[PDB]
Design a protein around this ligand. Structure first.
Ligand SMILES: Nc1ncnc2c1ncn2[C@@H]1O[C@H](COP(=O)(O)OP(=O)(O)O)[C@@H](O)[C@H]1O
Ligand SMILES: C[C@@H]1O[C@@](O)(CO)[C@H](O)[C@H]1O
Length: 479
Protein backbone atom coordinates (compact mmCIF):
# COMPACT_ATOMS: atom_id res chain seq x y z
CA UNK A 1 0.00 0.00 0.00
CA UNK A 2 3.08 2.19 -0.04
CA UNK A 3 3.43 3.77 -3.48
CA UNK A 4 6.67 4.03 -5.45
CA UNK A 5 6.72 7.18 -7.61
CA UNK A 6 9.56 8.33 -9.87
CA UNK A 7 10.22 12.05 -10.43
CA UNK A 8 12.46 13.37 -13.19
CA UNK A 9 13.57 16.94 -12.42
CA UNK A 10 15.73 18.63 -15.04
CA UNK A 11 17.25 21.98 -14.11
CA UNK A 12 19.65 24.14 -16.11
CA UNK A 13 22.60 22.98 -13.97
CA UNK A 14 21.68 19.32 -13.35
CA UNK A 15 19.11 16.58 -13.95
CA UNK A 16 17.93 14.03 -11.42
CA UNK A 17 15.82 10.85 -11.37
CA UNK A 18 14.48 10.29 -7.89
CA UNK A 19 12.29 7.65 -6.26
CA UNK A 20 9.70 8.50 -3.58
CA UNK A 21 8.07 6.01 -1.26
CA UNK A 22 4.79 7.18 0.17
CA UNK A 23 2.17 5.70 2.34
CA UNK A 24 -0.89 7.65 3.33
CA UNK A 25 -1.65 5.95 6.69
CA UNK A 26 1.90 6.60 7.87
CA UNK A 27 2.13 10.16 6.51
CA UNK A 28 5.62 8.90 5.56
CA UNK A 29 7.33 10.35 2.55
CA UNK A 30 10.88 9.35 1.63
CA UNK A 31 13.01 10.40 -1.33
CA UNK A 32 16.07 8.54 -2.74
CA UNK A 33 18.29 9.65 -5.60
CA UNK A 34 18.52 7.07 -8.38
CA UNK A 35 20.56 8.94 -11.02
CA UNK A 36 22.05 12.46 -10.98
CA UNK A 37 23.60 13.83 -14.19
CA UNK A 38 25.08 17.04 -15.55
CA UNK A 39 23.09 19.51 -17.60
CA UNK A 40 24.31 22.81 -18.88
CA UNK A 41 24.63 24.77 -22.04
CA UNK A 42 26.40 23.44 -25.10
CA UNK A 43 27.95 25.42 -27.89
CA UNK A 44 26.73 23.70 -31.05
CA UNK A 45 27.25 25.14 -34.56
CA UNK A 46 27.39 28.75 -33.25
CA UNK A 47 24.29 28.37 -31.05
CA UNK A 48 23.75 27.70 -27.37
CA UNK A 49 21.77 24.45 -27.09
CA UNK A 50 20.69 21.56 -24.82
CA UNK A 51 21.90 18.03 -25.43
CA UNK A 52 18.40 16.56 -25.32
CA UNK A 53 19.55 13.09 -26.53
CA UNK A 54 21.94 12.74 -23.58
CA UNK A 55 19.22 13.96 -21.20
CA UNK A 56 16.79 11.41 -22.64
CA UNK A 57 19.32 8.56 -22.25
CA UNK A 58 20.09 9.69 -18.67
CA UNK A 59 16.36 9.65 -17.83
CA UNK A 60 15.99 6.15 -19.32
CA UNK A 61 19.08 4.95 -17.43
CA UNK A 62 17.48 6.06 -14.15
CA UNK A 63 14.07 4.56 -14.99
CA UNK A 64 15.71 1.28 -16.02
CA UNK A 65 17.69 1.20 -12.75
CA UNK A 66 14.42 1.27 -10.74
CA UNK A 67 12.94 -1.40 -13.08
CA UNK A 68 15.95 -3.73 -12.78
CA UNK A 69 15.81 -3.46 -8.98
CA UNK A 70 12.37 -5.08 -9.26
CA UNK A 71 10.47 -2.14 -7.70
CA UNK A 72 6.75 -1.84 -8.54
CA UNK A 73 6.62 1.61 -10.14
CA UNK A 74 3.23 3.24 -9.65
CA UNK A 75 3.90 6.35 -11.72
CA UNK A 76 6.45 8.59 -13.44
CA UNK A 77 6.37 12.40 -13.77
CA UNK A 78 8.67 14.95 -15.43
CA UNK A 79 9.39 18.60 -14.64
CA UNK A 80 11.97 20.89 -16.28
CA UNK A 81 13.11 24.48 -16.59
CA UNK A 82 10.49 26.63 -18.35
CA UNK A 83 10.21 28.47 -21.69
CA UNK A 84 12.25 26.13 -23.94
CA UNK A 85 10.80 23.74 -26.52
CA UNK A 86 11.55 21.08 -29.11
CA UNK A 87 10.09 21.20 -32.66
CA UNK A 88 8.88 17.90 -34.18
CA UNK A 89 8.10 16.81 -37.74
CA UNK A 90 5.09 14.64 -38.69
CA UNK A 91 6.97 11.47 -37.66
CA UNK A 92 8.26 12.88 -34.36
CA UNK A 93 11.82 13.60 -35.44
CA UNK A 94 13.42 16.84 -34.23
CA UNK A 95 13.40 19.90 -36.49
CA UNK A 96 16.35 22.26 -36.13
CA UNK A 97 18.50 22.49 -32.98
CA UNK A 98 17.21 22.44 -29.37
CA UNK A 99 18.18 26.03 -28.79
CA UNK A 100 18.47 27.13 -25.15
CA UNK A 101 16.90 30.27 -23.62
CA UNK A 102 20.46 31.63 -23.04
CA UNK A 103 20.98 31.92 -26.84
CA UNK A 104 21.23 35.40 -28.29
CA UNK A 105 18.95 34.74 -31.35
CA UNK A 106 16.18 36.61 -29.56
CA UNK A 107 18.14 39.86 -29.02
CA UNK A 108 15.99 42.91 -29.87
CA UNK A 109 12.82 40.93 -30.49
CA UNK A 110 11.07 41.64 -27.17
CA UNK A 111 11.41 45.39 -27.80
CA UNK A 112 10.10 44.80 -31.35
CA UNK A 113 7.02 43.01 -30.00
CA UNK A 114 6.38 45.86 -27.54
CA UNK A 115 6.69 48.40 -30.39
CA UNK A 116 4.40 46.50 -32.78
CA UNK A 117 1.80 45.02 -30.41
CA UNK A 118 2.01 47.36 -27.41
CA UNK A 119 3.72 46.56 -24.10
CA UNK A 120 0.43 46.91 -22.23
CA UNK A 121 -1.42 44.78 -24.80
CA UNK A 122 1.07 41.88 -24.40
CA UNK A 123 0.98 42.21 -20.61
CA UNK A 124 -2.83 42.37 -20.33
CA UNK A 125 -3.25 39.36 -22.61
CA UNK A 126 -0.60 37.18 -20.90
CA UNK A 127 0.00 38.55 -17.38
CA UNK A 128 3.59 37.36 -17.93
CA UNK A 129 6.79 39.29 -17.08
CA UNK A 130 8.89 40.61 -19.92
CA UNK A 131 11.96 38.37 -20.29
CA UNK A 132 13.82 38.77 -23.58
CA UNK A 133 14.07 34.95 -23.95
CA UNK A 134 10.33 34.22 -23.44
CA UNK A 135 9.04 31.60 -25.91
CA UNK A 136 7.04 34.36 -27.66
CA UNK A 137 10.36 35.88 -28.80
CA UNK A 138 12.12 32.55 -29.44
CA UNK A 139 9.45 31.51 -31.94
CA UNK A 140 9.74 34.93 -33.62
CA UNK A 141 13.49 34.33 -33.92
CA UNK A 142 12.93 30.82 -35.30
CA UNK A 143 10.34 31.75 -37.93
CA UNK A 144 12.26 34.91 -38.99
CA UNK A 145 15.76 33.40 -39.11
CA UNK A 146 14.98 29.81 -40.13
CA UNK A 147 12.06 30.04 -42.62
CA UNK A 148 13.15 26.84 -44.40
CA UNK A 149 12.44 24.75 -41.26
CA UNK A 150 8.83 25.99 -41.00
CA UNK A 151 7.01 23.66 -43.44
CA UNK A 152 8.58 20.69 -41.67
CA UNK A 153 7.13 21.51 -38.24
CA UNK A 154 4.12 19.45 -37.13
CA UNK A 155 4.28 20.09 -33.36
CA UNK A 156 6.15 22.14 -30.75
CA UNK A 157 6.51 20.52 -27.31
CA UNK A 158 7.72 22.35 -24.21
CA UNK A 159 10.69 20.50 -22.65
CA UNK A 160 8.84 18.38 -20.01
CA UNK A 161 6.19 17.33 -22.57
CA UNK A 162 8.96 16.50 -25.04
CA UNK A 163 10.43 13.96 -22.64
CA UNK A 164 6.98 12.62 -21.68
CA UNK A 165 6.40 12.12 -25.42
CA UNK A 166 9.71 10.27 -25.86
CA UNK A 167 8.62 7.90 -23.09
CA UNK A 168 4.95 7.43 -24.02
CA UNK A 169 4.59 8.27 -27.72
CA UNK A 170 1.83 10.68 -26.71
CA UNK A 171 1.86 14.48 -26.82
CA UNK A 172 0.73 16.84 -24.06
CA UNK A 173 0.64 20.58 -23.48
CA UNK A 174 0.89 21.07 -19.73
CA UNK A 175 -0.69 24.27 -18.34
CA UNK A 176 1.78 25.45 -15.68
CA UNK A 177 4.67 25.36 -18.14
CA UNK A 178 2.57 26.63 -21.05
CA UNK A 179 2.13 29.90 -19.09
CA UNK A 180 5.92 30.50 -19.16
CA UNK A 181 5.73 31.03 -22.93
CA UNK A 182 4.03 34.45 -22.80
CA UNK A 183 1.66 32.87 -25.42
CA UNK A 184 -1.20 31.82 -23.15
CA UNK A 185 -4.12 34.17 -22.65
CA UNK A 186 -4.62 34.65 -18.90
CA UNK A 187 -8.45 34.84 -19.27
CA UNK A 188 -8.89 31.69 -21.38
CA UNK A 189 -6.03 29.35 -20.31
CA UNK A 190 -5.56 28.77 -24.05
CA UNK A 191 -3.07 30.01 -26.65
CA UNK A 192 -3.56 33.70 -27.54
CA UNK A 193 -4.22 34.01 -31.27
CA UNK A 194 -2.70 37.49 -31.62
CA UNK A 195 0.49 36.52 -29.79
CA UNK A 196 0.83 33.31 -31.82
CA UNK A 197 0.30 35.32 -35.01
CA UNK A 198 3.13 37.74 -34.13
CA UNK A 199 5.49 34.89 -33.17
CA UNK A 200 4.90 33.21 -36.57
CA UNK A 201 3.92 30.00 -34.82
CA UNK A 202 0.91 27.99 -35.86
CA UNK A 203 -1.82 27.11 -33.33
CA UNK A 204 -1.91 23.61 -34.89
CA UNK A 205 1.62 23.03 -33.53
CA UNK A 206 0.13 22.93 -30.05
CA UNK A 207 -2.86 21.53 -28.17
CA UNK A 208 -5.22 23.05 -25.62
CA UNK A 209 -3.24 23.37 -22.35
CA UNK A 210 -4.23 20.74 -19.80
CA UNK A 211 -4.07 21.20 -16.05
CA UNK A 212 -1.76 18.88 -14.10
CA UNK A 213 -2.87 15.37 -13.14
CA UNK A 214 -3.81 13.71 -16.38
CA UNK A 215 -2.22 10.46 -17.54
CA UNK A 216 -0.24 11.37 -20.68
CA UNK A 217 0.36 7.73 -21.58
CA UNK A 218 2.39 4.78 -20.42
CA UNK A 219 6.01 3.73 -20.26
CA UNK A 220 7.28 0.11 -20.22
CA UNK A 221 10.12 -1.41 -18.13
CA UNK A 222 12.18 -4.09 -19.98
CA UNK A 223 9.56 -6.39 -18.36
CA UNK A 224 6.38 -5.26 -20.15
CA UNK A 225 4.31 -3.75 -17.32
CA UNK A 226 2.49 -0.46 -18.04
CA UNK A 227 3.47 2.50 -15.87
CA UNK A 228 1.42 5.70 -16.15
CA UNK A 229 3.34 8.84 -17.08
CA UNK A 230 1.51 11.68 -15.35
CA UNK A 231 1.49 15.34 -16.40
CA UNK A 232 2.72 17.06 -13.24
CA UNK A 233 3.11 20.80 -12.61
CA UNK A 234 5.75 20.44 -15.24
CA UNK A 235 7.38 23.87 -14.90
CA UNK A 236 10.12 23.16 -12.34
CA UNK A 237 9.26 26.36 -10.43
CA UNK A 238 5.57 25.31 -10.26
CA UNK A 239 6.65 21.99 -8.72
CA UNK A 240 8.95 23.79 -6.26
CA UNK A 241 6.14 26.07 -5.12
CA UNK A 242 3.90 23.02 -4.50
CA UNK A 243 6.50 21.53 -2.11
CA UNK A 244 7.22 24.83 -0.35
CA UNK A 245 5.56 24.50 3.11
CA UNK A 246 3.64 27.78 2.78
CA UNK A 247 1.54 28.72 5.76
CA UNK A 248 -1.37 30.92 4.65
CA UNK A 249 -1.54 34.35 2.98
CA UNK A 250 1.48 35.71 4.89
CA UNK A 251 3.98 33.21 3.36
CA UNK A 252 6.30 33.91 0.44
CA UNK A 253 8.67 31.62 -1.47
CA UNK A 254 12.14 31.91 -2.96
CA UNK A 255 12.87 29.03 -5.30
CA UNK A 256 16.65 29.14 -5.40
CA UNK A 257 18.68 27.38 -8.11
CA UNK A 258 20.18 28.66 -11.33
CA UNK A 259 17.42 31.29 -11.12
CA UNK A 260 16.02 32.82 -7.93
CA UNK A 261 12.21 32.94 -8.27
CA UNK A 262 10.69 35.07 -5.52
CA UNK A 263 6.91 35.28 -5.18
CA UNK A 264 3.63 34.39 -3.56
CA UNK A 265 0.48 32.42 -4.48
CA UNK A 266 -2.83 34.05 -5.42
CA UNK A 267 -6.29 32.93 -6.52
CA UNK A 268 -6.30 35.92 -8.89
CA UNK A 269 -3.63 37.48 -11.10
CA UNK A 270 -2.25 41.02 -10.84
CA UNK A 271 -2.03 42.69 -14.24
CA UNK A 272 -2.60 46.32 -13.15
CA UNK A 273 -0.17 49.19 -13.79
CA UNK A 274 1.65 48.51 -10.51
CA UNK A 275 2.35 44.92 -11.62
CA UNK A 276 3.31 46.05 -15.13
CA UNK A 277 5.75 48.69 -13.83
CA UNK A 278 7.38 46.13 -11.51
CA UNK A 279 7.51 43.56 -14.33
CA UNK A 280 5.77 40.99 -12.14
CA UNK A 281 4.72 37.61 -13.63
CA UNK A 282 1.53 35.59 -13.02
CA UNK A 283 2.70 32.09 -13.81
CA UNK A 284 0.25 29.14 -13.82
CA UNK A 285 0.12 26.95 -10.72
CA UNK A 286 -1.52 23.72 -9.62
CA UNK A 287 -5.17 24.29 -8.63
CA UNK A 288 -5.19 27.53 -10.68
CA UNK A 289 -3.18 29.18 -7.91
CA UNK A 290 -1.16 31.85 -9.73
CA UNK A 291 2.52 32.09 -8.92
CA UNK A 292 2.92 35.84 -8.69
CA UNK A 293 6.68 36.24 -8.83
CA UNK A 294 9.71 37.88 -10.35
CA UNK A 295 12.73 36.25 -11.94
CA UNK A 296 16.01 37.14 -10.27
CA UNK A 297 19.24 36.21 -12.08
CA UNK A 298 20.25 34.17 -9.08
CA UNK A 299 23.08 31.69 -8.55
CA UNK A 300 23.77 31.51 -12.30
CA UNK A 301 26.28 34.33 -11.60
CA UNK A 302 28.14 32.12 -9.12
CA UNK A 303 27.94 29.00 -11.32
CA UNK A 304 29.79 30.96 -14.01
CA UNK A 305 32.42 32.34 -11.60
CA UNK A 306 33.11 28.85 -10.27
CA UNK A 307 33.84 27.55 -13.74
CA UNK A 308 35.95 30.59 -14.79
CA UNK A 309 38.12 30.61 -11.66
CA UNK A 310 38.28 26.79 -11.49
CA UNK A 311 36.79 26.58 -7.97
CA UNK A 312 35.79 23.00 -7.06
CA UNK A 313 34.86 23.39 -3.35
CA UNK A 314 31.75 25.53 -3.07
CA UNK A 315 31.18 24.93 0.67
CA UNK A 316 34.72 26.19 1.29
CA UNK A 317 34.11 29.28 -0.87
CA UNK A 318 30.94 30.08 1.13
CA UNK A 319 32.81 29.66 4.42
CA UNK A 320 35.60 31.99 3.22
CA UNK A 321 33.05 34.53 1.95
CA UNK A 322 31.47 34.68 5.43
CA UNK A 323 34.65 36.41 6.70
CA UNK A 324 34.47 39.27 4.17
CA UNK A 325 32.76 42.54 5.09
CA UNK A 326 29.35 43.02 3.43
CA UNK A 327 28.00 45.45 0.80
CA UNK A 328 31.28 46.82 -0.51
CA UNK A 329 30.44 45.48 -3.97
CA UNK A 330 26.90 45.93 -5.20
CA UNK A 331 25.69 45.09 -8.69
CA UNK A 332 22.20 44.65 -10.11
CA UNK A 333 22.08 40.93 -10.92
CA UNK A 334 19.01 41.40 -13.10
CA UNK A 335 20.84 43.67 -15.55
CA UNK A 336 20.63 42.08 -19.03
CA UNK A 337 24.43 42.13 -19.21
CA UNK A 338 24.44 39.11 -16.89
CA UNK A 339 22.18 36.82 -18.93
CA UNK A 340 25.08 35.20 -20.82
CA UNK A 341 28.31 37.24 -20.96
CA UNK A 342 31.39 35.50 -22.35
CA UNK A 343 33.36 36.50 -19.26
CA UNK A 344 31.26 36.61 -16.07
CA UNK A 345 34.02 37.75 -13.66
CA UNK A 346 35.02 40.58 -16.00
CA UNK A 347 31.39 41.64 -16.39
CA UNK A 348 30.82 41.80 -12.62
CA UNK A 349 34.07 43.79 -12.26
CA UNK A 350 33.07 46.19 -15.03
CA UNK A 351 29.66 46.76 -13.42
CA UNK A 352 31.31 47.57 -10.06
CA UNK A 353 33.87 49.94 -11.62
CA UNK A 354 31.09 51.76 -13.51
CA UNK A 355 29.44 52.48 -10.13
CA UNK A 356 32.65 53.89 -8.55
CA UNK A 357 32.92 50.91 -6.23
CA UNK A 358 35.96 48.89 -5.23
CA UNK A 359 36.60 45.98 -7.58
CA UNK A 360 35.82 42.43 -6.39
CA UNK A 361 38.82 40.34 -7.48
CA UNK A 362 39.44 37.37 -5.19
CA UNK A 363 37.18 34.30 -5.48
CA UNK A 364 35.60 35.16 -2.15
CA UNK A 365 35.09 38.81 -3.21
CA UNK A 366 33.29 37.78 -6.39
CA UNK A 367 31.09 35.46 -4.32
CA UNK A 368 30.54 38.23 -1.76
CA UNK A 369 29.41 40.68 -4.46
CA UNK A 370 27.00 38.06 -5.83
CA UNK A 371 25.48 37.13 -2.42
CA UNK A 372 25.06 40.73 -1.15
CA UNK A 373 23.69 41.88 -4.54
CA UNK A 374 21.20 38.99 -4.60
CA UNK A 375 20.11 39.68 -1.02
CA UNK A 376 19.46 43.37 -1.73
CA UNK A 377 17.44 42.42 -4.80
CA UNK A 378 15.52 39.84 -2.70
CA UNK A 379 14.55 42.65 -0.29
CA UNK A 380 13.54 44.92 -3.17
CA UNK A 381 11.32 42.31 -4.78
CA UNK A 382 9.73 41.11 -1.54
CA UNK A 383 8.81 44.75 -0.84
CA UNK A 384 7.35 45.15 -4.37
CA UNK A 385 5.25 42.00 -3.97
CA UNK A 386 3.86 43.02 -0.54
CA UNK A 387 3.07 46.52 -1.85
CA UNK A 388 1.38 45.01 -4.92
CA UNK A 389 -0.99 42.65 -3.05
CA UNK A 390 -1.52 44.98 -0.05
CA UNK A 391 -0.34 42.37 2.43
CA UNK A 392 2.94 41.82 4.28
CA UNK A 393 4.72 38.46 4.67
CA UNK A 394 5.68 36.88 8.01
CA UNK A 395 7.87 34.10 6.63
CA UNK A 396 9.95 33.52 3.50
CA UNK A 397 10.47 29.89 2.42
CA UNK A 398 13.75 29.30 0.60
CA UNK A 399 13.79 26.00 -1.28
CA UNK A 400 16.07 24.47 -3.96
CA UNK A 401 19.80 23.81 -4.08
CA UNK A 402 20.37 27.46 -3.08
CA UNK A 403 18.69 26.85 0.28
CA UNK A 404 21.87 24.96 1.29
CA UNK A 405 23.77 28.28 1.25
CA UNK A 406 23.48 29.23 4.91
CA UNK A 407 25.28 32.51 4.30
CA UNK A 408 22.79 33.61 1.65
CA UNK A 409 19.85 32.36 3.75
CA UNK A 410 20.90 34.68 6.60
CA UNK A 411 21.66 37.60 4.27
CA UNK A 412 18.21 37.23 2.80
CA UNK A 413 16.55 37.18 6.26
CA UNK A 414 18.59 40.21 7.36
CA UNK A 415 18.09 42.29 4.18
CA UNK A 416 14.36 41.48 4.04
CA UNK A 417 13.87 41.80 7.82
CA UNK A 418 11.85 38.59 7.71
CA UNK A 419 12.01 35.09 9.18
CA UNK A 420 13.49 32.69 6.62
CA UNK A 421 12.67 28.99 6.64
CA UNK A 422 15.04 26.89 4.49
CA UNK A 423 14.01 23.58 2.96
CA UNK A 424 13.27 21.20 1.37
CA UNK A 425 16.31 21.14 -0.89
CA UNK A 426 14.76 19.11 -3.71
CA UNK A 427 11.46 21.00 -3.78
CA UNK A 428 10.88 20.50 -7.55
CA UNK A 429 11.28 16.74 -7.19
CA UNK A 430 8.89 16.71 -4.21
CA UNK A 431 6.14 18.77 -5.95
CA UNK A 432 6.47 16.49 -8.98
CA UNK A 433 5.88 13.49 -6.66
CA UNK A 434 2.97 15.31 -5.04
CA UNK A 435 0.92 15.62 -8.22
CA UNK A 436 1.59 11.98 -9.06
CA UNK A 437 0.21 10.94 -5.64
CA UNK A 438 -2.90 13.03 -6.34
CA UNK A 439 -3.55 11.17 -9.61
CA UNK A 440 -3.07 7.90 -7.69
CA UNK A 441 -5.77 8.99 -5.17
CA UNK A 442 -3.15 8.92 -2.39
CA UNK A 443 -3.21 12.64 -1.61
CA UNK A 444 -6.09 15.17 -1.86
CA UNK A 445 -4.53 18.56 -2.63
CA UNK A 446 -1.48 20.83 -2.43
CA UNK A 447 -2.24 22.08 1.10
CA UNK A 448 -2.33 18.47 2.42
CA UNK A 449 0.94 17.78 0.63
CA UNK A 450 2.62 20.80 2.25
CA UNK A 451 1.59 19.38 5.66
CA UNK A 452 3.46 16.17 4.70
CA UNK A 453 6.54 18.12 3.60
CA UNK A 454 6.54 20.18 6.79
CA UNK A 455 6.53 17.04 9.02
CA UNK A 456 9.00 15.14 6.82
CA UNK A 457 11.66 17.55 5.44
CA UNK A 458 14.55 19.24 7.27
CA UNK A 459 13.55 22.84 7.90
CA UNK A 460 15.98 25.41 9.23
CA UNK A 461 14.91 28.79 10.66
CA UNK A 462 16.99 31.93 10.05
CA UNK A 463 15.89 34.78 12.28
CA UNK A 464 16.43 38.35 10.98
CA UNK A 465 19.28 40.21 12.69
CA UNK A 466 18.62 43.97 12.90
CA UNK A 467 22.26 44.69 13.78
CA UNK A 468 23.86 42.85 10.84
CA UNK A 469 26.05 44.61 8.26
CA UNK A 470 23.44 44.17 5.51
CA UNK A 471 20.59 45.18 7.85
CA UNK A 472 22.52 48.38 8.68
CA UNK A 473 23.14 48.93 4.96
CA UNK A 474 19.43 48.51 4.11
CA UNK A 475 18.39 50.85 6.95
CA UNK A 476 20.66 53.57 5.53
CA UNK A 477 19.30 53.28 1.95
CA UNK A 478 15.74 53.93 3.21
CA UNK A 479 16.26 57.46 4.58
N1 LIG B 1 26.38 22.02 -0.63
C1 LIG B 1 25.92 23.23 -1.07
N2 LIG B 1 25.98 24.38 -0.35
C2 LIG B 1 25.52 25.57 -0.80
N3 LIG B 1 24.95 25.70 -2.01
C3 LIG B 1 24.83 24.63 -2.84
C4 LIG B 1 25.31 23.31 -2.42
N4 LIG B 1 25.05 22.44 -3.42
C5 LIG B 1 24.46 23.16 -4.42
N5 LIG B 1 24.32 24.45 -4.06
C6 LIG B 1 23.74 25.54 -4.85
O1 LIG B 1 22.58 25.06 -5.52
C7 LIG B 1 22.60 25.45 -6.89
C8 LIG B 1 21.87 24.41 -7.68
O2 LIG B 1 20.49 24.49 -7.28
P1 LIG B 1 19.38 23.65 -8.09
O3 LIG B 1 18.04 23.91 -7.41
O4 LIG B 1 19.74 22.18 -8.20
O5 LIG B 1 19.50 24.38 -9.52
P2 LIG B 1 18.77 24.14 -10.95
O6 LIG B 1 18.09 25.45 -11.11
O7 LIG B 1 19.90 23.95 -11.94
O8 LIG B 1 17.83 22.98 -10.82
C9 LIG B 1 24.07 25.44 -7.23
O9 LIG B 1 24.30 26.36 -8.28
C10 LIG B 1 24.69 25.97 -5.95
O10 LIG B 1 24.76 27.38 -5.96
C1 LIG C 1 13.71 29.54 -17.93
C2 LIG C 1 13.72 29.77 -16.43
O1 LIG C 1 14.08 28.53 -15.77
C3 LIG C 1 13.21 28.35 -14.63
O2 LIG C 1 12.24 27.32 -14.95
C4 LIG C 1 14.04 27.86 -13.45
O3 LIG C 1 14.66 26.61 -13.77
C5 LIG C 1 12.54 29.70 -14.39
O4 LIG C 1 11.32 29.58 -13.61
C6 LIG C 1 12.37 30.16 -15.83
O5 LIG C 1 12.15 31.55 -15.94
Amino acid sequence: TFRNCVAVDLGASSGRVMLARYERECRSLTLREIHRFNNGLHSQNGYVTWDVDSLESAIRLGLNKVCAAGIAIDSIGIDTWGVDFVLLDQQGQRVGLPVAYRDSRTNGLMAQAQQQLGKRDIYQRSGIQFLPFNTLYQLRALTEQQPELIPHIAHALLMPDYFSYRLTGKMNWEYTNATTTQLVNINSDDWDESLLAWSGANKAWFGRPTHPGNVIGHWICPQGNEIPVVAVASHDTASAVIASPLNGSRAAYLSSGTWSLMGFESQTPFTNDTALAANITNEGGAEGRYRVLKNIMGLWLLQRVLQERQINDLPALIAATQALPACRFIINPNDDRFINPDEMCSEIQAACREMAQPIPESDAELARCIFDSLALLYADVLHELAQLRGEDFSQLHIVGGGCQNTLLNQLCADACGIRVIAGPVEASTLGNIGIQLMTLDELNNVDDFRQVVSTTANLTTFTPNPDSEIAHYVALIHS
